[PDB]
Amino acid sequence: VPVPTGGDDPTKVAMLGLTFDDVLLLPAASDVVPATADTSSQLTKRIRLRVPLVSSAMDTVTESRMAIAMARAGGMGVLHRNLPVAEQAGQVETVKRSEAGMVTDPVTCSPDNTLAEVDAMCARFRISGLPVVDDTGELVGIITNRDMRFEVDQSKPVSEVMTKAPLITAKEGVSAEAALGLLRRHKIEKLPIVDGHGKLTGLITVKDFVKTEQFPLSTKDSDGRLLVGAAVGVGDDAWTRAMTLVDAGVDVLIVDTAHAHNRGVLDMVSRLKQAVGERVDVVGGNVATRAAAAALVEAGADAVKVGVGPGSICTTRVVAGVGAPQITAILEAVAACKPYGVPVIADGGLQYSGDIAKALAAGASTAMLGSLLAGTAESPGELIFVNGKQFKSYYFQDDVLSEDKLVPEGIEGRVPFRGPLGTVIHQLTGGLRAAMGYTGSATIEQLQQAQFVQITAAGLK
Amino acid sequence: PEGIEGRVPFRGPLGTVIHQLTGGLRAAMGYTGSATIEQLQQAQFVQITAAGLK
Amino acid sequence: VPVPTGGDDPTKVAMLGLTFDDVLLLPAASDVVPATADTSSQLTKRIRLRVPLVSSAMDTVTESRMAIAMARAGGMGVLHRNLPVAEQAGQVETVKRSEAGMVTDPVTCSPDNTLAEVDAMCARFRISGLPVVDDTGELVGIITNRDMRFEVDQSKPVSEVMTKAPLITAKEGVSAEAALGLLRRHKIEKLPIVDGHGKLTGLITVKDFVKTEQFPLSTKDSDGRLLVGAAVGVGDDAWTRAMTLVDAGVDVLIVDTAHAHNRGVLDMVSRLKQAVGERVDVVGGNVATRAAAAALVEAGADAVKVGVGPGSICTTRVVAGVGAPQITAILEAVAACKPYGVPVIADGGLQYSGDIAKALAAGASTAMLGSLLAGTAESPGELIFVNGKQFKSYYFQDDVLSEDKLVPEGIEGRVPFRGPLGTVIHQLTGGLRAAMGYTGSATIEQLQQAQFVQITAAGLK
Amino acid sequence: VPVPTGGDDPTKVAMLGLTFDDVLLLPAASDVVPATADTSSQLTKRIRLRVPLVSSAMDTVTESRMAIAMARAGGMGVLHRNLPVAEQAGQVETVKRSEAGMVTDPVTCSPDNTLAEVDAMCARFRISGLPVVDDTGELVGIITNRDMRFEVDQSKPVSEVMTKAPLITAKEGVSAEAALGLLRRHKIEKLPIVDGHGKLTGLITVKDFVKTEQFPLSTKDSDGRLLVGAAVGVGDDAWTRAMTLVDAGVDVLIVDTAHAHNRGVLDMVSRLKQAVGERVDVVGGNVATRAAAAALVEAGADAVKVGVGPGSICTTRVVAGVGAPQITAILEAVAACKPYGVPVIADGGLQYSGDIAKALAAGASTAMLGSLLAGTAESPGELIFVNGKQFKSYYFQDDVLSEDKLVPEGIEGRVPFRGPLGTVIHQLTGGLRAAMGYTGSATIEQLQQAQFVQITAAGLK
Ligand SMILES: Nc1nc2c(ncn2[C@@H]2O[C@H](COP(=O)(O)OP(=O)(O)OP(=O)(O)O)[C@@H](O)[C@H]2O)c(=O)[nH]1
Ligand SMILES: Nc1nc2c(ncn2[C@@H]2O[C@H](COP(=O)(O)OP(=O)(O)OP(=O)(O)O)[C@@H](O)[C@H]2O)c(=O)[nH]1
Ligand SMILES: Nc1nc2c(ncn2[C@@H]2O[C@H](COP(=O)(O)OP(=O)(O)OP(=O)(O)O)[C@@H](O)[C@H]2O)c(=O)[nH]1
Ligand SMILES: Nc1ncnc2c1ncn2[C@@H]1O[C@H](COP(=O)(O)OP(=O)(O)OP(=O)(O)O)[C@@H](O)[C@H]1O
Ligand SMILES: Nc1ncnc2c1ncn2[C@@H]1O[C@H](COP(=O)(O)OP(=O)(O)OP(=O)(O)O)[C@@H](O)[C@H]1O
Ligand SMILES: Nc1ncnc2c1ncn2[C@@H]1O[C@H](COP(=O)(O)OP(=O)(O)OP(=O)(O)O)[C@@H](O)[C@H]1O
Ligand SMILES: [Mg+2]
Ligand SMILES: [Mg+2]
Ligand SMILES: [Mg+2]
Ligand SMILES: [Mg+2]
Ligand SMILES: [Mg+2]
Ligand SMILES: [Mg+2]
């Protein structure tokens, strides 16, 4: 009748929880070469990444710069929501406008504006070339960086400096090969695209072709723009934030909570899925059990994020006594999500590339990276020297169960510097490809079927 | 054994200590869905290994 | 012919400078008991302190609270100038209004004010009871804290709560004994003072008598208000600041510069001396040589402050290569100041109470305390607990040679907590009295005649 | 005109003070073997020690046990005064009654005393045998430990247990050889000494002869009793204490103050010298200058104790800024005391046996040992074990300038254990004999003529 660990209830201690340090991947029969392993995996039901890594929605990790770098490297970034709605939507617009096959609404000016006004617009949009349109809206010329750098009078009007028409233009529906051929034939960097009446419709640049050459792994939509995601909370303010982010062109909305097994979180996920589910993917917040993941799947989540107090010395574990070891949490959530084709994102507790391999082997489809990217060059903050060491120096946060609530008030800052993001991503992908080679996994979907060996405490000495 | 014990370190006012402890308890109640202490007495544990203490 | 340290110029290495660690006070014939030694000393030519200690004009040391505490303990506080002119003059007013023989400009309300507005006035001025005057100027009542505390409705007019006239009042020129006898006979705390016409002219409180009995060492003017000093820089902004501070009732102005051997500083000292010299005393900034002290005396300074890079690992020493050991600097400055009766304030480099005694024995009249007071309860800042330890948390600074120009941009704060100011002052004064007993110095002027023994490096191991 | 270290006064810095670490003894022409070096020296004008060492009058160093052990080793002990007058006089009596050539007031019982009363008297006086006298005063027998150890009945009277007369006795003034021969012939440990009437006058024991053989270097008066010293302060309580101690049989009185250059201390020395000078020697308290030593010599002191803040990190140096390096202080005091034949006792700053040699070579006649003896088994306290280590666990103090007035309240205790006193004394005397061998000094008076070499800071690395 009694339980060996105490009491008369055998379900009081429901499980033994394994963390990353408890397991190792077993070698298996392999013809897979590490350099030829396919590391592509599903982020949501509709979005597939070339590198199964996403950066966290933390204010020390992902802003527009980190999102652009992650999308270029084959992953994706999730923009944090610790800021006003308009500023977050502006960061989304910055990421979506970084590059494209064709600029659909290019920034234009008028012949009357002074060169200082064009300078201000160039600074505001971080571009250097503008087509010029009059009151009638007809294309009259183009003013670029070459014209302006050779003019001292900043009060001159555009008409006196601009390259007047006829310009090298192209018609709507022009092929990329033909557009690039025109650009190289005339030795120009810009090519406006016009309709049948001669009105401006778009702009094609050489720099977009060069960027496509330089970053062949980029995560992009059908228009050639980088994909980005953004985090929202729960409540009416979160609804307005989500609608603004959807207008700005976000691709993924992550309902980001510390404890998603809540009726409010599930209702928010269902509401967003009904409202904008045709366009954007909705990802459910952090869960750690099978029942919570099943509830999120029932609510219509396109992916389930897993982890609740996954770190060993975690503040949730110390202050509230609440946690779930991450390997067991991933196994339990995958048991609920896999029959419906809903991907799992492992969020938290990753220290090494081996942990990424173990998390993918346990069943997750992607890993979300936090502290591993906090000190990179692309992360927010300014780079400063202190005692010969390099560091990175820097209303919302409405989650009642978030760790910032549990921690006492104080000061934190001066995260260390870690170098460029590309080297970190290269090292992590190298570890993952080595694991795929050892396990004989040609794809991530095959890696999700690999076996573990459980090790004892002596194996960690 | 016979000896000397003394000089306990100072810890501040009692109110902040009680506030911190009750805040942690309320966070646990929110995580487990326990509206009262009697419901908190029905919550489940997960046992962790030694690697969970490092 | 060549100098043994190199070169041919024997004045290239001008002197050997002694710091505090190099010297000790020699015991001499003594009949002085440490408890009956007289530690009074001149701060300026006209101001004598019971305890020869002054707090530094640093934004982590002296604000109104520290100034009040220092003046009550027998010293004085100098308010820092790292703040707007209005805020500094307001802190001057806060110190001057802490206590007096008779409040000569009492705060009054009108019979039509409401209890919320009277409560707001009490909040603004940190008082609790107001006399009431009508548009005629006649005293018709008084409303104090007992009247307000029992009234739940804060919208009631004063005329419905106030104690109506006739009140317990007294004529101008009443002796203190008579006023206290009236206050005790009628068992009240406040006594309005009116002229022959019954128009309100002042107020006398029991709290002032209690404060006078409680702090018998207080530094006070002829009106019984606490003395205070403030720091000013150089320039036109400094002139406006100095005039404002004089209007607010400051008693000492300190032209506080890192390098006072400069025409600008000398001209500022002369200007203040000619403008406001009959009311306030003017103290010249930091010098380290005989010639600079002589220049300040010729300019007309009432006291001379001494110390330029006086600490061993000072930032001025490391970054600029400039400094002066403090014992030698004090000796050189006193050689210029003593024949004219100008007191010397030793600023910087003090670590222990023995150093205070040594500074006074070298010829200084007062010591200025910085870091030794930064962590006390009366210094600016809020008290917090960080990891089991107690810490104190927290356009101007236009001095071209100040240390903040030399230290790189960075972060500072969280000074350690050090307890109440009274215990620190007690310990320092006890050390000074012990030194006076050892050297046979009944007064500070006799301590200024004591002899030193120079010790070697082995005596510092 | 200017002094190179500052100011115009060349006497402001009077001297350069040498400590022990600043000097070494230079080897000189020698024919002295360390084993045959004579280490005897004068403590006062009338007392010569075989080992020139005295233990400090500290409550952690010298009580009756330490004083007895020191006097047996050839030095002397000074009983501390941090205790009631009766208890210090009792400790003086304990030391003086430890051994003698002949016991002059032997403890006696009466035939009607029970065995329990005799046991109580034995424990009180720490003896084991008693002569028995009647009301007539005739010696009626003797009861020793042998008689009592075989008695089960504690309630019996002495007359039934004692060895009845006739006893083996001797006449007054019997020689040492005759008394010891009579003791050995009858195989007894005790020999009463009687007068012409046969009334008891004294007692001779074999244990005293054995002690004289066992400790041949003992410091003794003419009666064969060990010498002891005791400290007094200043005041009328101190005068009463001094008179009580002189009655108890003290040999040296030390007016023990932190600063003896005081009229109170000098007048106390003169008073004691005039009242009890012919019986006991008076030693003057701590000085550090030639003038103070000259004043003590004029007051009539028989020895002068030297040292005021001699330790490098002494509390007097840190808190009051007062001190004097010990080598220079000894040289200065000897310059005043030697022409008058007054010995100098060096007190404080001694860490090694080499320091003892340096202090004697500087001119001192004896060294006072403080912290070097606090851990020894003979020092007061109880030996205990804590964490595998051995430690020694433990109204007055009117000296206004003492270190305990300077140090804040807190916890001091648990001095570490250091072993038996004899080993420490042996090590120190071996060092001193090696120094005498190197310098060619046959006596301490020749060692006082040895030369020093001053070393630089590089010699201490
Ligand atoms: N000119 C322009 N570029 C835009 C606009 N919106 C986004 N972009 C992107 O900005 C990049 C072009 O920036 P520009 O500064 O104009 O570059 P460029 O002068 O053509 O090229 P470089 O001389 O190689 O820098 C391309 O990747 C465009 O897709 C827009 O309105 N105008
Ligand atoms: N009432 C009053 N006190 C003033 C004013 N300005 C300065 N003070 C000082 O503030 C103190 C009186 O403050 P209150 O709290 O009003 O005095 P109280 O009610 O008599 O004092 P308690 O003993 O605290 O009840 C005295 O030291 C006054 O000298 C003023 O305008 N009104
Ligand atoms: N018997 C005795 N000894 C005294 C007295 N006062 C001091 N002493 C000293 O104490 C020692 C003798 O102590 P006892 O215990 O009687 O010695 P004992 O029994 O002869 O000696 P052992 O048996 O060898 O220990 C000698 O050193 C005496 O000088 C006294 O009143 N009586
Ligand atoms: N489509 C076009 N038709 C005609 N002239 C053009 C066109 N695009 C650019 N120009 C003109 O050609 C010149 C070079 O412009 P281009 O866009 O090639 O580079 P740029 O941004 O001006 O130069 P850079 O990036 O080297 O500073 C400018 O004088 C510009 O006005
Ligand atoms: N001079 C005065 N003449 C008449 N009434 C007075 C006078 N001073 C005070 N009172 C009245 O006496 C009462 C007690 O006020 P008092 O100033 O003595 O203390 P309080 O500051 O109001 O209260 P407490 O200090 O005890 O909290 C009040 O009702 C007040 O209006
Ligand atoms: N002078 C004496 N004449 C005669 N008998 C004596 C004399 N002194 C001691 N005795 C006795 O001789 C016996 C031996 O005593 P002794 O003094 O030799 O040693 P003790 O101190 O009694 O014993 P222990 O052997 O423990 O030291 C005792 O019975 C004692 O009473
Ligand atoms: Mg360009
Ligand atoms: Mg270019
Ligand atoms: Mg009141
Ligand atoms: Mg009151
Ligand atoms: Mg015996
Ligand atoms: Mg025996």
Neighbours of D314 (CB within 10 A): 20
Q: Is the CB of A305 under 6 A from ligand 1?
A: no
Mutation pick for ligand 4 pocket among A109, A118, A132, A144 (CB with most ligand atoms within 8 Å)? A144
Q: Tokens for A159, please give them.
A: 């008409």
Instruction: Verify whether residue A314 is a known catalytic residue.
Output: yes
Residues 6+ apart with CB under 8 A from D422: D69, D73
Instruction: Indicate which ligand has the atom closest to the C-alpha of C145.
Output: 5
Angle of helix D353-361 relative to helix D421-439, nearest 10 degrees, comes to 50
The answer, yes or no, to whether any atom of ligand 6 lies below 6 A from the CB of D142, is yes
Strand order in the sheet with A170-171: A170-171, A190-194, A200-205
Q: Is A347 in the pocket of ligand 1 (CB under 6 A)?
A: no
Half-sphere exposure (Cβ direction) of D327: Cα atoms closer than 13 Å:
27
Quote the DSSP letter at residue D413: -
Separation of alpha carbons C364 and C43, rounded Å: 10
Atom 28 of ligand 6: nearest residue by CA position:
D146
User: What is the atom index within ligand 6 of the atom nearest the CA of D147?
Assistant: 29
Q: Chain C residues within 8 A (CB-CB) of chain B?
A: 385, 388, 390
Inspect the interface and report whether the beta carbons of B16 and C388 lie closer than 8 Å.
no
Contacts C440 to D, Cβ<8 Å: 261
Listing DSSP states for D108-162 in one string gives -B-TT-BHHHHHHHHHHHT---EEEE-TT-BEEEEE-HHHHHT---TTSBGGGTS
**Residue C295, token pair as written in the block:** 């220049």
As a residue count, chain B comes to 54
- Closest of A432, A461, A431 to residue A447, by C-alpha: A432
Residues with CB under 6 A from ligand 3: D 97, 99-100, 103, 106-107, 125, 127-129, 189-190, 203, 205, 207-208, 211
Q: What is the DSSP letter of A319?
A: I
Per the structure block, which two tokens stand in for D392? 């020694």
Strands D252-255 and D281-287: parallel
Atom of ligand 6 nearest to the CA of D167: 3
Chains that touch C (3 or more CB pairs under 8 A): A, B, D
Q: In this structure, is the dihedral angle defined by the CA atoms of residues D444, D450, D453 and D454, taken in order, positive or negative? A: positive
Give Cβ neighbours of residue C92 (< 8 Å, ≥ 6 apart).
Answer: C79, C228, C230, C245, C248, C249, C250
Q: Find chain B residues with C-beta within 8 A of C388's C-beta.
A: 9, 11
Q: Note whether C385 and C363 are within 8 A (CB).
A: no
Residue A139 in contact with ligand 4 by CB distance below 6 A: no
Residue D322, beta-bridge partner list: C25
**CB within 8 Å: A14 and B45:** yes
User: Distance from A321 to chain B by nearest Cα, in Å?
Assistant: 7
D107 CA to centre of ligand 11 in angstroms: 15
CA distances for D367 relative to C202, D52, D75, D372, D400, angstroms: 72, 7, 10, 12, 25
Is residue C388 a known part of a binding site?
A: no
Please tell me the distance between residue A101's alpha carbon and the centre of ligand 8 in angstroms: 18
Give the sheet arrangement for strand D382-386, strand by strand: D382-386, D389-393, D415-416
For residue D386, give the chain B residue with the closest CA. B3
Q: Is A163 in the pocket of ligand 4 (CB under 6 A)?
A: yes
CA-CA distance, C338 to C445, in Å (whole number)?
11
Query: Which one-letter DSSP state was computed for residue A344?
Result: E
Other C-beta atoms lying within 10 Å of the C-beta of residue A93: 16
Q: How far is the CA of C205 from the centre of ligand 2 (A)?
A: 6
Q: Are D32 and D436 in contact (CB under 8 A)?
A: yes
Contacting residues of C for B11, CB less than 8 Å apart: 388
What is the C-alpha separation between C271 and D39, in angstroms, rounded?
A: 75
What are the φ and ψ backbone dihedral angles of D255, each rounded to 5 degrees? -75, 100
Of all residues in chain A, the one with the smallest CA distance to C412 is A411
Query: Does the distance separating the beta carbons of D411 and B3 come in below 8 Å?
Result: no
Please give the Cα distance from A134 to A132 (Å, whole number).
7
By a Cβ cutoff of 8 Å, what residues of chain B touch chain A? Answer: 20, 23-24, 27-28, 30-33, 44-54
> Which of left, alpha, beta for A321 (phi over 0: left; psi -120 to 50: alpha)?
left
Cβ–Cβ gap B16/C385 under 8 Å: yes
Chains that touch B (3 or more CB pairs under 8 A): A, C, D
Check pocket membership of A106 for ligand 1, CB cut-off 6 A: yes
Pocket test for ligand 1, best of A205, A209, A220 (most atoms within 8 A of CB): A205
Q: Among C300, C247, C422, C437, which residue's Cα sits nearest to residue C357? A: C437
CB of A42 closer than 6 angstroms to any ligand 1 atom: no
Q: Could you tell me where the DSSP H helices lie in A172-287?
A: 176-186, 206-214, 236-248, 263-276
Identity of residue A45: K
Distance D48 CA to ligand 12 centre (A): 34
How far is it, in rounded angstroms, from Cα A55 to Cα A374?
10
Ligand 2 pocket list (CB less than 6 A): C 97, 99-100, 103, 106-107, 125, 127-129, 145, 189-190, 203, 205-208, 211
Residue D186 in tokens: 């009858």
Q: Per the structure block, which two tokens stand in for A378?
A: 């692309």
Nearest CA to ligand 5 atom 21: C145
Contact state of D288 with C27 under an 8 Å Cβ cutoff:
yes
Q: Which amino acid is it at A231?
A: A
Q: Which residues in chain C have Cβ-Cβ distances shorter than 8 Å to A386?
A: 410
Q: How far is the CA of A224 from the centre of ligand 1 (A)?
A: 14
- By the 10 Å C-beta count (0-12 exposed, 13-18 middle, 19+ buried), C277 is classed as middle
Residue D405: list chain C partners with CB under 8 A.
34, 430, 434
Q: How many A from CA of C207 to the centre of ligand 2?
A: 7
Q: Is the CB of residue D146 below 6 angstroms from any atom belonging to ligand 6?
A: yes
SS (H, E, C) chain C: CCCCCCCCCCCCCCCCCCCHHHEEECCCCCCCCHHHCCCCEECCCCCEECCCEEECCCCCCCCHHHHHHHHHCCCEEEECCCCCHHHHHHHHHHHHCCCCCCECCCCCECCCCEHHHHHHHHHHHCCCCEEEECCCCCEEEEECHHHHHCCCCCCCEHHHCCEECCCCCEECCCCHHHHHHHHHHCCCCEEEEECCCCCEEEEEEHHHHHHHHHCCCCCECCCCCECCEEEECCCHHHHHHHHHHHHHCCCEEEECCCCCCCHHHHHHHHHHHHHHCCCCEEEEEEECCHHHHHHHHHHCCCEEEECCCCCCCCHHHHHHCCCCCHHHHHHHHHHHHHHHCCCEEEECCCCCHHHHHHHHHHCCCEEEECHHHHCECCCCCEEEEECCEEEEECCCCCCCCCHHHHCCCCCCCCEECCECHHHHHHHHHHHHHHHHHHHCCCCHHHHCCCCEEEECHHHHC
- DSSP class of residue D235 equals S
Specify the residue with its C-alpha closest to ligand 3, atom 1: D129
Give the distance from residue C417's alpha carbon to the nearest chain B alpha carbon, in angstroms.
Answer: 13
Write down which chains contact chain D via at least 3 CB pairs under 8 A.
B, C
Of the listed ligands, the closest to the CA of D127 is 3
Peptide bond into A166 cis (omega under 30): yes
Resolution (A): 2.4
